[PDB]
Amino acid sequence: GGGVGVSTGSYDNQTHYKFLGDGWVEITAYSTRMVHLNMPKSENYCRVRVHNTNDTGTASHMAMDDAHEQIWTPWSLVDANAWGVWFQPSDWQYISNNMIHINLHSLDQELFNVVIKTVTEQNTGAEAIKVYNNDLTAAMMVALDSNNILPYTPAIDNQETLGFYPWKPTIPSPYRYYFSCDRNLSVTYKDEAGTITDTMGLASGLNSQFFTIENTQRINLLRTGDEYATGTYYFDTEPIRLTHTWQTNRHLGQPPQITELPSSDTANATLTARGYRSGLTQIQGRNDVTEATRVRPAQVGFCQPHDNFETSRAGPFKVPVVPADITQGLDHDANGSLRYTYDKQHGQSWASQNNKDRYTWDAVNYDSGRWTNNCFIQSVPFTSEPNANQILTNRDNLAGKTDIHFTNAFNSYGPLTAFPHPAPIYPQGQIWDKELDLEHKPRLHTQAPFVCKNNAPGQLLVRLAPNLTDQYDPNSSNLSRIVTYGTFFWKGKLTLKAKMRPNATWNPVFQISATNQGTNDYMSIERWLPTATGNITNVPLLSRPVARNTY
Amino acid sequence: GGGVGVSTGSYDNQTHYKFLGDGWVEITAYSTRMVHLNMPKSENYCRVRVHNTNDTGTASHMAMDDAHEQIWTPWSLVDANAWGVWFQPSDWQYISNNMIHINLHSLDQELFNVVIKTVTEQNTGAEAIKVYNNDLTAAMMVALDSNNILPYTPAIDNQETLGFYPWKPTIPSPYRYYFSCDRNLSVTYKDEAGTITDTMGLASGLNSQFFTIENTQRINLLRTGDEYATGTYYFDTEPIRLTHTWQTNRHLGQPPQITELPSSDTANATLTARGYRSGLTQIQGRNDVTEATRVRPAQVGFCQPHDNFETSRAGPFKVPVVPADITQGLDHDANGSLRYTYDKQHGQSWASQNNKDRYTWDAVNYDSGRWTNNCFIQSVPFTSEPNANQILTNRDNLAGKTDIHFTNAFNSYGPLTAFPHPAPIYPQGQIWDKELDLEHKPRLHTQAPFVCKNNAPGQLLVRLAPNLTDQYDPNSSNLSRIVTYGTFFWKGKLTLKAKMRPNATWNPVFQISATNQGTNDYMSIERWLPTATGNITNVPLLSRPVARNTY
Amino acid sequence: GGGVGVSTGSYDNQTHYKFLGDGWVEITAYSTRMVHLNMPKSENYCRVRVHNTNDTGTASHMAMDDAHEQIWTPWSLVDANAWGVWFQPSDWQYISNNMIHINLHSLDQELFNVVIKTVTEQNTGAEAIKVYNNDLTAAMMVALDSNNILPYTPAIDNQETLGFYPWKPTIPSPYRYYFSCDRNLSVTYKDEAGTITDTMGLASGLNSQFFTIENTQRINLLRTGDEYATGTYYFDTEPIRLTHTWQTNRHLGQPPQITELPSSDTANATLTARGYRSGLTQIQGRNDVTEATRVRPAQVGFCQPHDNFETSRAGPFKVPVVPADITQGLDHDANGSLRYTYDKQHGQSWASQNNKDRYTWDAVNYDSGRWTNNCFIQSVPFTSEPNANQILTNRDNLAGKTDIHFTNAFNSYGPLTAFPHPAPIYPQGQIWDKELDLEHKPRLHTQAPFVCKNNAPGQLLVRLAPNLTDQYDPNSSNLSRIVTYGTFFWKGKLTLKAKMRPNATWNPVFQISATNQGTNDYMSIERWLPTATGNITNVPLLSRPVARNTY
Ligand SMILES: CC(=O)N[C@@H]1[C@@H](O)[C@H](O[C@@H]2O[C@H](CO)[C@H](O)[C@H](O[C@]3(C(=O)O)C[C@H](O)[C@@H](NC(C)=O)[C@H]([C@H](O)[C@H](O)CO)O3)[C@H]2O)[C@@H](CO)O[C@H]1O
Ligand SMILES: CC(=O)N[C@@H]1[C@@H](O)[C@H](O[C@@H]2O[C@H](CO)[C@H](O)[C@H](O[C@]3(C(=O)O)C[C@H](O)[C@@H](NC(C)=O)[C@H]([C@H](O)[C@H](O)CO)O3)[C@H]2O)[C@@H](CO)O[C@H]1O
Ligand SMILES: CC(=O)N[C@@H]1[C@@H](O)[C@H](O[C@@H]2O[C@H](CO)[C@H](O)[C@H](O[C@]3(C(=O)O)C[C@H](O)[C@@H](NC(C)=O)[C@H]([C@H](O)[C@H](O)CO)O3)[C@H]2O)[C@@H](CO)O[C@H]1O
């Protein structure tokens, strides 16, 4: 039933594995958090703009423009979407090593053991002690948006999701969303003479959308004995592959036939002379077949315009880039490696004195990357040994500029392009994402492995109902109210489908393994262990350890 | 149902006896305690090491090395395993006198009448009074580990088990477990010149295990009206014998036949001359049969290496020793007598000004002990009247050292060895123990009479759920929280099977009996009685009073 | 049906995995080999002795004595018992990483596609060409001993088992067994004056056993179209644990309670003073409790007499030693680490110019090892700070000899001893073994994980039936016969039961992983890969990667 002095739920953070048959595993991940909620700093919906002129008023600083318009709401959201919420590091190891693909099934959520307290300051003076006592009749307002009427607002974008540590309490993310506003910011370079427009526009009768939680939602009122339960949500998603691909566009198909086996282990094999070699090529006018010029089934990976900034009405923004392997040439931005910034709750370490910690994720698929300094375009009719005018290298100045080269603006994407879908990032990364409502849709989102086809799981919104003092004027601009905060337990259940991997290879596969301390190896075990004072860190685990044959 | 203002359980500490048939008794022992729980001194799992260089940095002090590595947890354990929890002294007398063997059957446990209070300090100043008031919505976290996933950690090792006095409240033991770390400590003697290594190692990727209660367990949340009940656990164990054996290896079999009965009560009987005596001996080349040299069915008891310190990766440790009778020669360590150190809650007396009280338990089986100064080895071919070179005594210096003798290093254990299983120690001693997970297992554990064959009874873990103030930063290193403590009642039911003893002897058997005060006899009654100020002591009762025929 | 020109079997070397339910896996390993058989070098049973006087005629060389007596038989045995026959390296990785325990179920064997050819030398002269042609009517003799009447003779002892490479043909091991003979070899040291007896004895009417394959067995005759199939054999065995134990005798039980948590990550925690500490110890006369001297449930591991040579009638031999961890002190022989010697067929590399390759296997269980220089025995009554006469160290000269110390002769094994069962060695190691027919049996065999309780799987014996020329005299001492050899396919199916491991730990477990070439790390991948000329090596894989809680 429930009431004062009776718990409305239980605490389960453990993860379970059922083996359903041959190779198939049902993974059930329970997660529970104690959540700390503060009375909102304003009772009102606010429409606020951040316009930073100090940064953008001076030339060439375009890329740091923050200017936008947002609706601030008194509500806060409980957002469970990150991988670090659901699993402990060893679970991720076990899944990553043993399973060929995995998929989302269902999601459950609960709120229980609501506690609301009021704060009074007794013994006013140098002592200034605070007294804490229960308000048994106070309520917490809870709303779930199942129909996704409100703007969809993943909390992991700002790393505001529930913490990754079962035994540490966590806080909600305050709910907010963008509002339509036009921005004009002119494009300049460093120390350029002129004037930067740097203006924002008036509200648009066309594009204005102001949503209210109270008008769009059914709000449940939870006192202490109350509990709230979301129904079971079911994902419709495609499974993601947990094995990386090594196999480049030059590894596809049948190798050339060697003339004979080499005599010693140090010797190299030889091939039929390229003039006499059989094969298929799209080069005209030459009788040759070379491993580089032979036709392949598809383009694996593609060149992407990198550090591309395009401007629509809202302002400049960087065009996303499909994550691919940074090659031996290490260039990160061409291949669009992800870079995370996160706090102690989600990562970092309590030993760290910095405000945030940063990690650059490199794609684990060694096939589709591009190494730009070694890319080139050659003139037609094709020739062996091109001269300087017959080949375009990455050392060539585009539009007479020293640091701009054709690979900056070059886009090779086309019908023949094939690339792997990027990989989940265990402690910090977005599990699922809502699909855009546009008619023509992207083939993949960049940050999130799973995209909900029809309807995303709802956003769970909470706030404290206001406690009013004895004096309340509805027409007053300032509102006096009782200082109040609350805590509650969030529990959720995430079910996944996965399948065990085969091993057909003679040789041992790569695995995620712990390593002794004292060597600086990334997997050195002490990083997953507590310290003497209880400091702990949770760092990104490599994913997709095991290789796969593409073709 | 339960709620605020309704008790969720009852208090039964009394012990019951059912007589089920011929000689068979079902013993049901109820025990109840009020338990006092403090908010944990840290919210974090901590990995801490104690390395005492002051003791081990100087030579010959090896035996006092404390160095290890442990995981400190915020959780506390309620541990009912000691004999002093379950029985009052007269119950132990009654069982020990009348019963030939006894065995464990089942165990139940309950938690009820949870009370949680918060502490505030009013009237700040010289008065500095504390105010106590109920937090009705606060919860206590409870976890039972049935599957024994967590490291198994008997609280009686440190004497941290629940107190032995029904009317006195008791406290939990904080839960902690060892963590893998390597230690190097060199071996030295007193005033030896050199350097002692005395180092500890870095964490091991191989051996590191860090467990979390939240990740491995299902935690129940208990408010005031809530109660928790363990299911019934069932022991699989072998019964233990409650009668001692007197019968030495020289008492086995048929005595020699006397020539004639003696003439007076003071006279001694005589035997057939050893040269003419019939018998069986393993001595070669002599025609004799003596009571000492005649063959016996088995070796009763065996010589043990004593004060043996062996070193694996973790450090030096003393090898355990099967408890046996300290003989007329009184030597304790050769026969491995147990020595307990315990506090007022478990023993001692509230009249005592010492921090702890100490008792040395001597084995009650008078057969299998070894008296070392009278042990010797004799050369082959055997001879009567050996000279100094033909016999090895315990006065002989081994490796040219004054205080080391062969009985230190000598191990006689073999296929013919038979010894009694040691005995339970009533007020302070471990009732049951979990079996090691190794493949080749010890025949008995040294401290505990009962060893659980398959799965030990679960460990019962508790903590207070954190109470947070109005200001909580998840990323802050320091955590401010409301001062909170709680109390609850622990109740348990331990069922035992026992069988009454026969008496076939003409003469009266030895019994455990009280004795008048004024003589210093160990059983003097005032030790079991309260004092004027209420001080009470509970001291070890001898066990296995009644003799038994071995063969 | 079968006949000339029809194959009687198929080639399956692949390994299969069925998932039967929760955590349970049925592993089916097929293995197939082409076997090359030569006409035996003698048609007779021969009783031969090797007596090497050159080695043992001179003092101190006792340990190299090879002297024995054997029955040489014309038969050869096909022996499938090694782990390297059944699995490819990645299969062993997969099993070793993911499975907590494993057990033998059944064994099948087949012989098919028998080919027998005769050799004639045409064009006698400098050319001396050999001609090969089929003898269609020739037969191969096949016998399986199900009842184990013949002496049991594992071929892996000499590393004569079928090769580890599916695509490489292999040869049988010629069948032979020991014959009873007495040897006298006196014990001497280097450059000792005297005479060494070094004799062997005459045949014993008591102990002589001469077995014949033809008299004890039913032999099947296989021509080309014939095939042979063993029935299904079923093992009765205990499963073996695939997880190592780290937990030393000093890691057992509850750690001491620290006074307070340390202030900084560099600080060490402190414990209650040993004089005031509660606990249980077997030391008498001291009021202390130390981590080294506190009582533990059992002895984990034990000291073993090492390089112990005992002599029965047959000669000197080294006493086996239970494999245990070689500690930080690295001493191998005290802990009995295994050392293998093997050829290219079973290992090594075809790049190697040495005749054999050698590997020393160190036990993977980090608990039960002994580090001998740090072991010591201390005098009674116990004292802190012993002087030189009060402690026996490993630097102390035993019997006045420089290099002999008490740990050489010291045996701590007893009732309290517990140790792990050693681990399987993947490429080279014996899977199963027959149990000795003695009444009192060893608790484990040293080399083989699995011991057959009742009846071992039969030995499969083969030979070519003799081809006789036109001239045959039964009474002639020399036998002229047609040069003949044969080939056949051996196929076998080994079924195993295994169970997946749980992971309850927060931190990542250690795993077997491949590693990039260019670092000298043991797991560097190129060792599992072919070379340019086709050379390949198969090296021992570490086993039991994942840690386990002992207690
Ligand atoms: C090209 C050049 O001149 N220098 C580069 C250098 O920029 C690059 O990274 C630097 O070098 C250090 C090497 O110890 C780190 O890699 C630093 O990166 C940090 C970061 O991104 O801020 C530090 C941070 O602490 C790290 N993360 C954690 C959880 O500790 C991350 C992390 O290692 C990476 O993100 C991995 O993806 O890196 C940065 O100052 C180095 C890279 O080796 O190469 C030089 O040539
Ligand atoms: C050999 C020698 O030089 N002297 C020994 C002496 O060590 C030994 O014990 C001492 O003598 C007194 C006699 O009154 C006690 O036996 C002391 O032992 C204590 C102990 O272990 O600390 C005192 C303690 O108070 C006692 N326990 C309780 C509950 O009161 C225990 C207890 O009596 C024993 O453990 C019984 O097992 O003993 C100690 O100072 C004596 C023993 O008689 O013999 C001398 O020769
Ligand atoms: C104590 C001392 O004076 N020297 C030891 C030394 O004996 C010991 O081993 C030697 O050092 C080399 C180091 O490269 C090898 O370990 C050699 O061992 C061999 C062997 O057993 O013959 C060589 C062999 O090729 C190796 N096996 C394979 C398959 O390649 C094996 C193998 O590495 C081991 O058996 C592993 O168990 O070793 C030997 O000459 C070294 C060990 O590091 O330590 C010195 O201190």
UniProtKB/Swiss-Prot annotation, chains A, B, C:
Binding annotation for Mg(2+): N147
Record-level Gene Ontology MF annotations: metal ion binding; structural molecule activity
Location(s), subcellular: Virion; Host nucleus
GO cellular component terms, A-Z: host cell; host cell nucleus; T=1 icosahedral viral capsid
Presence of the UniProt keyword Magnesium in the record: yes
Chief location bin: virion
Keywords: Capsid protein, Clathrin-mediated endocytosis of virus by host, Cytoplasmic inwards viral transport, Host nucleus, Host-virus interaction, Magnesium, Metal-binding, Microtubular inwards viral transport, T=1 icosahedral capsid protein, Viral attachment to host cell, Viral penetration into host cytoplasm, Viral penetration into host nucleus, Viral penetration via permeabilization of host membrane, Virion, Virus endocytosis by host, Virus entry into host cell
GO-annotated biological processes: clathrin-dependent endocytosis of virus by host cell; microtubule-dependent intracellular transport of viral material towards nucleus; symbiont entry into host cell via permeabilization of host membrane; viral penetration into host nucleus; virion attachment to host cell
Domain note: The N-terminus of VP1 is sequestered within the mature capsid. It contains a phospholipase A2-like region and putative nuclear localization signals.
UniProt similarity note: Belongs to the parvoviridae capsid protein family.
Function: Capsid protein self-assembles to form an icosahedral capsid with a T=1 symmetry, about 22 nm in diameter, and consisting of 60 copies of two size variants of the capsid proteins, VP1 and VP2, which differ by the presence of an N-terminal extension in the minor protein VP1. The capsid encapsulates the genomic ssDNA. Capsid proteins are responsible for the attachment to host cell receptors. This attachment induces virion internalization predominantly through clathrin-dependent endocytosis.
Protein name: Capsid protein VP1
Residues of the full protein shown: 179 to 729 of 729
